[PDB]
């Protein structure tokens with residue numbers, strides 16, 4: 001069902017949180033070889049999550065589930081805010097700009113934290 005697909009997409013989101021928090025510890029420790037690998041792992045996790053959410057949104061549209069479509073449009077817009085902040089963070093790591101990396105990291109934590117009430121609303125709506 002779309003609801004079990006949403007549980008699967010959500011688990012992937014939680015994998016990214018786990019990897020992201022491990023990556024923040026590596027960044028703080030200056031272990032850039034680990035950070036590089038966690039940033040590759042996070043990209044693949046975000047590209048997977050993004051595609052799965054798009055399938056959920058498209059299914060909700062085909063089902064005519066107007067409330068789920070509304071909430072999924074709001075969430076997939078915010079997902080792009082997070083994804084943009086992540087990509088800037090990757091660029092800061094490439095450029096050796098730890099100040100920008102720190103900044104983008106906190107922004108990505110706050111963007112994610114904000115979008116959690118809506119993430120849990122979508123589970124109940126589908």
Ligand SMILES: O=C(O)Cc1c[nH]c2ccc(Br)cc12
Pocket residue numbers: 042043046047049050051053076079080082083084086087108
């Ligand atoms: O997860 C998505 O739906 C979009 C996305 C694609 N790449 C990302 C990287 C970080 C964060 Br946060 C989000 C993304």
